[PDB]
Each structure stands twice: as C-alpha cells, then as structure tokens.
Amino acid sequence: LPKKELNLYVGMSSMQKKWYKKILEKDESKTRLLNIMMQLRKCCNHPYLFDGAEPGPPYTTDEHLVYNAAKLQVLDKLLKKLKEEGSRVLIFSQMSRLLDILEDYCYFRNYEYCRIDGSTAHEDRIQAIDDYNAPDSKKFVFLLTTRAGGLGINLTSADVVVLYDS
DNA sequence: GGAAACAGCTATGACCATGATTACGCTCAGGATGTATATATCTGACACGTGCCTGGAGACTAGGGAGTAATCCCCTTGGCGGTTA
C-alpha cells in the first residue's frame, strides 16, 4: 500500500498581515531582525510567537487563536474530519514554543495525546510512545517535534501525518 | 446554766485616687548682635580709537588619498537537544 501526499496551500492570515508588513517594512518595532529568515519564518508559522500578538492579560483561550491563525482553521476542519474518519494523526513542527500553543489548543478541544519534545525525559518518551501506540488508543492527536521526534520510531498505529511547517 | 462557737460589727491601715506644687522648657519677650541697605564719593581698570603690518585670503597647479566596484569566505546568528549543576 503506497502513501498519499497533499500540500495544503493556505493563505497567510489577514489578521497577522499587519505584523507581517511590520516585519517587511520594519514598522512590532524596536527589536532584533538579525535573522530575517527566522523572523518571517515565525510569522509564516504563527503570529502569537512575536510576544504581544496575544494582548490579553488573562490570555484568553478561545476560537480567536484559530481565528487569528492562517493554518489552524484548516486544521480545525481536518481535525473534525479525521475525528469522524478515525484517522490517528501525527503532527510535526520545528518550534517547540509553537507546540506549547498547540498543547494549549489541544486542551481547548479536549483531545487525549502525548507531547514528546526535545529533552522531555527518557522514561517519559517510552511511556508516551506506549500510550499513543496502545491498542485502541483514544489519543487522537500526537504532538511531536521534527529534529527530536522522527528518527527511527515506528507509529504503525497511526496512518496520517501532518507537517505544520517545512 | 455555763461554755464554746460562730457571726456581725467595728475600726484601722493600706492603697489608690486626686489636688497642688514645682521645675523646666519654651516660646515668646526682650535685649544683643551682627547684616543688609542706601548713599555719596574715589579710582583704577576696562573699553575704545589709532596706527601698522603680516597673516589671511585668494590664485594656481599637480599628483596621489580617497572613493567605488567586484569579489569572497569566513562568521555570526538562532533555534534546538540534551545535560546538570
């Protein structure tokens, strides 16, 4: 059985277009751009990563996060579809900090999962893998990094794997 | 009927409360003192004219400092992963 591949070209969120211009035109201000590569990469990845895109002193946790994000709207659609389809999904990303927001947004949707990140533990890696690969595991999603997570482990219990970033 | 025993009354001392007195401080008094003020008058120093002259300001040439292009490559940068003190 082969594998399918689709590249979900989604438009960059209009809400963060303010800050994306604020990065291109150097408009928010008075910070580093020593690696314009990464700065645009983080804005390409997620807006709240720039330390002030989340204005709330209580830091509200609601649909605004998926609202202000370009990708998570398609993610929310695909998570709803794959939940009914029973697809056991794996998510890969580069920024461990971004995964915190996904961990927070996983809490919002109340999914079971296990978060493996660079330098979590030794026994925690084993146990989180076991719970995810446990038979009939309801851990519908699985947070994982890119350069720390997928270098030899087998996840045949899963079928669909999604990249947040390239 | 007498003696003991207890109870109540009385007085006195003790202790606390109030009144006065005093002393000390201070804040007014008042004196002492030293300071500001004004004024009228010297006077020396600062400002200004005069003369002069030599640096300043052009005027002119020439030759390499500075300026730019192109090139490159090494290095700083940043995020992570995983340790541990």
Side-chain angles (χ1 to χ4, degrees):
Chain A
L1 184 57
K3 55 180 286 187
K4 289 201 290 288
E5 177 178 358
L6 282 72
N7 292 324
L8 305 176
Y9 294 102
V10 299
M12 171 294 268
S13 185
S14 179
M15 170 46 188
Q16 65 180 340
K17 281 180 178 86
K18 299 182 292 293
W19 291 271
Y20 187 78
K21 291 182 180 181
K22 294 180 176 66
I23 303 165
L24 286 175
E25 277 81 5
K26 284 82 68 178
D27 303 323
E28 190 276 331
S29 63
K30 299 165 75 71
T31 57
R32 295 291 186 269
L33 293 175
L34 287 178
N35 197 356
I36 314 166
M37 294 194 229
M38 296 299 102
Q39 304 302 323
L40 294 173
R41 201 174 180 182
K42 294 182 183 178
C43 185
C44 182
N45 275 318
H46 173 96
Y48 293 99
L49 301 181
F50 289 93
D51 214 16
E54 184 177 1
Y59 305 88
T60 62
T61 302
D62 205 358
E63 296 283 330
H64 69 294
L65 181 61
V66 70
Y67 180 80
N68 300 137
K71 301 176 185 177
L72 294 175
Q73 294 176 359
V74 179
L75 276 296
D76 184 358
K77 284 272 271 153
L78 180 59
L79 289 178
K80 291 185 285 181
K81 284 154 146 163
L82 294 185
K83 186 180 176 183
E84 299 172 355
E85 298 181 0
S87 296
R88 182 68 179 271
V89 68
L90 302 178
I91 310 166
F92 298 159
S93 173
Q94 299 292 141
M95 294 299 291
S96 68
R97 311 181 74 255
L98 184 134
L99 288 181
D100 291 330
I101 318 185
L102 269 67
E103 183 178 1
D104 291 336
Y105 174 71
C106 292
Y107 170 71
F108 183 80
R109 294 178 65 88
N110 293 314
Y111 293 173
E112 295 188 357
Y113 62 96
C114 276
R115 183 177 178 179
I116 300 299
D117 201 304
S119 74
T120 52
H122 182 74
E123 52 84 19
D124 203 358
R125 295 181 185 271
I126 289 164
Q127 68 94 52
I129 282 295
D130 298 349
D131 283 336
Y132 192 74
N133 277 9
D136 183 28
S137 175
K138 189 62 180 67
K139 292 184 175 66
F140 173 64
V141 298
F142 189 74
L143 293 180
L144 190 47
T145 68
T146 309
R147 186 175 64 248
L151 293 174
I153 62 174
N154 200 6
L155 288 178
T156 58
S157 86
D159 52 354
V160 294
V161 168
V162 293
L163 287 167
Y164 194 85
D165 54 357
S166 296

